[PDB]
Amino acid sequence: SGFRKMAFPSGKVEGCMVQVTCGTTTLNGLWLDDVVYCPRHVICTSEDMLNPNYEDLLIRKSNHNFLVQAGNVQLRVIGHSMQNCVLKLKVDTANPKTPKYKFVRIQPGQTFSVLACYNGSPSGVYQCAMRPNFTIKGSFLNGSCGSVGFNIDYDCVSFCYMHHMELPTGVHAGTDLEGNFYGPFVDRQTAQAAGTDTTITVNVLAWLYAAVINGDRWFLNRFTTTLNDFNLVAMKYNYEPLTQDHVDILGPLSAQTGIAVLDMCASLKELLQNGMNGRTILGSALLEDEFTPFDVVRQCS
């Protein structure tokens, strides 16, 4: 037993990380088959970043402008193009360590593992949720750009995130591997803020099921409720609405414990109004919303 925030084993991804230099910018690249993927803002000077014309800045560049280092070896860049906010550098050599992989776009409320990297060197791994406001609460310093997020499904790595920048509130914004931003953000030195965030309701309830499976049961009660009643409490407390889709996804956990989702919504309703009455749940004093139902079933079954 026990319940811990757990990343996927990062080895299949560690073997894809490289360093990419263009002028006086160094950051991380993802090397799969004969392509390296990295943020397009790699081509930009501090001057350029205020109002970049990426079309124009990029035709002015050539293969020899991009320095790609896999460990202590140089990669010959033999082609370059841009897909959305992602730069694609064709290289002479196919990554001998390319795993089975897919490019996937994740939904708000879904989790993934981040492999934080510096100068193409894997540094750390942690789990993140894609917030409803389309930011993530990561841990990133200068040179972490091009670090990636992913899930693993048996042998297949599904890459879903590439890190681009930090917003002024300390939270993080990036693209899918097709270079489309998560959220209403631009890769340009301009005035940008994260929208007000909401709590991921289905994840909070997943975590309460994890708490019950681990013998933390005090918050339970004899009551039940309805979507409509609860959702009026949720909206007041900046909680995402709970749908019938959410209640079905939690079905496996409602069974395994004898607390039915609206039964558990009753407990959750009470925790929002009255608080935790000074207790903890799984060693947190907050209601944790970064574990999915899958995350809980995965770890507790």
Next chain:
Amino acid sequence: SGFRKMAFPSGKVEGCMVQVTCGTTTLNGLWLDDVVYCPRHVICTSEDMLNPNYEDLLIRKSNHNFLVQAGNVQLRVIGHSMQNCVLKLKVDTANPKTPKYKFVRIQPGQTFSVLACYNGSPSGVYQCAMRPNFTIKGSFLNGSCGSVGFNIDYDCVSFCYMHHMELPTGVHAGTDLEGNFYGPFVDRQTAQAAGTDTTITVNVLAWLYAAVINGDRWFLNRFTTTLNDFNLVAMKYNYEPLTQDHVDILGPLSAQTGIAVLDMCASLKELLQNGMNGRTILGSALLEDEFTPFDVVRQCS
């Protein structure tokens, strides 16, 4: 910026994990060079676990009682011996993925990454601390025995923990890779229970310094404390005594932030008296004690 429980990239450890079977019992082993390390309890049956005479059980085994398996490949065992509570199986093949490694025994308060494994397959990675009562607060289901804990400082893998068992309070006990248990625990099914756990004071202080570095000042105060007055207060909250050693270790974070260690102690004393009054520090509503002074510097500017 940001601050996260962050595990080391697990890749170098993943390439070392194998499955060990003896009788009807399967768990994980650690394959380094021509040696597979696993818990010796793998040779126990139902009766044996109450008073196992491990020397008597092992002499009755030959090499071919041990089925070892690296993915699909069977490894052939050609030798076995016991060192304390760890079984060492000699195999005909040296592991080609063997990283630069070493075995270190850690002290209470030290952190490491756990690669949770089932049937020799890595399942997830997370951070733990050796509690002052020599247990760890892990996430371990049946089959996870032989999972290891490690640091990776400067490309060398330091193995510090092999998982043996769960205590009735739902916390985890294991050995160093020389087979010596952390704490007074034993690999027999007898009435053993962890000591009362305490908070790792040096770690809480390091985390408060992390909070300041990341731009939080709300919990600072105009007070200081003697080291001795601080210890007489902190022990009333079940905090570990803070020693001159611990004060020395925080010197760098003191200098980086300009807050003297005993001033930060005055802030911790106040937080224990007051709580957080509906605020949070680095995303927590509790005082976190599983980040070392070294972890704070690795992750922070």
